[PDB]
């Protein structure tokens, strides 16, 4: 919801 946590893999 804000941007950071993801970045897959």
């Amino acid at each position, epitope marked *: *919801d*804000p941007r*950071p*946590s*993801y*970045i*897959s*893999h």
Partner: antibody, heavy 120, light 110 residues
Framework: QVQLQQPGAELVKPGASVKLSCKAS????????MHWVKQRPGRGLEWIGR????????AYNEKFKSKATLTVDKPSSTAYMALSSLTSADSAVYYC?????????????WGQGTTLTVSS | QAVVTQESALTTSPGETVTLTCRSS?????????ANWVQEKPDHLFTGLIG???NRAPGVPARFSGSLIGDKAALTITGGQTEDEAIYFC?????????FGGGTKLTVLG
């Protein structure tokens, strides 16, 4: 009911390598990420890293990159983690915790943790 | 890197509200840290309750909720139950790794 079964105690000598397992069940194994946490009395909980059952992609903690190697066996729905060049500090309990998606989200299920004891 | 701190221990009674906080040494806890709270009931029984500052885990009792209180992340428990006495851990995300706090030893005088 979602369950993550991990061995309870493992005994191994300093210098060897172990491959801790983590059996999943009760959900589609490849829809959620798996993380590994290390806990030692004193300190608290330290994140090791994760793997994505679908992609195989993984993100490690800079401090554990040359120490652990995560992987998964889709068939048997199990996540593994080999720790290399074992020492005294590597002794402790190691958990595998399932990760949830969408807008970041959470860490809902956990395994009971395997207590690794490294001594000779 | 970014040591995270929570309260040593806290004591509450059944029926009241107790709040737990989480400190981020890099400054403030923000919606971008995706605060995560995890409970530790005796004999290594771990359960996630809250993830991403305020998303409640599925199957998690309604009385649990997460939020931001100032420049901190907090777990509020309204109507504390006896079984709620356990250890609570705070998880903070920092660009590419997870940092927990030391955990808070919660006591519900049941």
């Amino acid at each position: 009911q979602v369950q993550l079964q991990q061995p309870g105690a493992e005994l191994v000598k300093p210098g060897a390598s172990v491959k801790l397992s983590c059996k999943a069940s009760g959900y589609t194994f490849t829809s959620y990420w798996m993380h590994w946490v290390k806990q030692r009395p004193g300190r608290g909980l330290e994140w090791i890293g994760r793997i994505d059952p679908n992609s195989g992609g993984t993100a490690y903690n800079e401090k554990f990159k040359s120490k652990a190697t995560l992987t998964v066996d889709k068939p048997s729905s199990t996540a593994y983690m080999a720790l290399s060049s074992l020492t005294s500090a590597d002794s402790a309990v190691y958990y595998c915790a399932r990760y949830d998606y969408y807008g970041g989200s959470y860490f809902d299920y956990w395994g009971q943790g395997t207590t690794l004891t490294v001594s000779s | 890197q970014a040591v995270v701190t929570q309260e040593s221990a806290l004591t509450t009674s059944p029926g009241e509200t107790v709040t737990l906080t989480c400190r981020s040494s890099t400054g403030a806890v923000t919606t971008s840290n995706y605060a995560n709270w995890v409970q530790e009931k005796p004999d290594h029984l771990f359960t996630g309750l809250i993830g991403g500052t305020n998303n409640r885990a599925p199957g998690v009792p309604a009385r649990f909720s997460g939020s931001l209180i100032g420049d901190k992340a907090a777990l509020t428990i309204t109507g504390g139950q006896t079984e709620d006495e356990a250890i609570y851990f705070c998880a903070l995300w920092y660009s590419n790794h997870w940092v927990f706090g030391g955990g808070t030893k919660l006591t519900v005088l049941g």
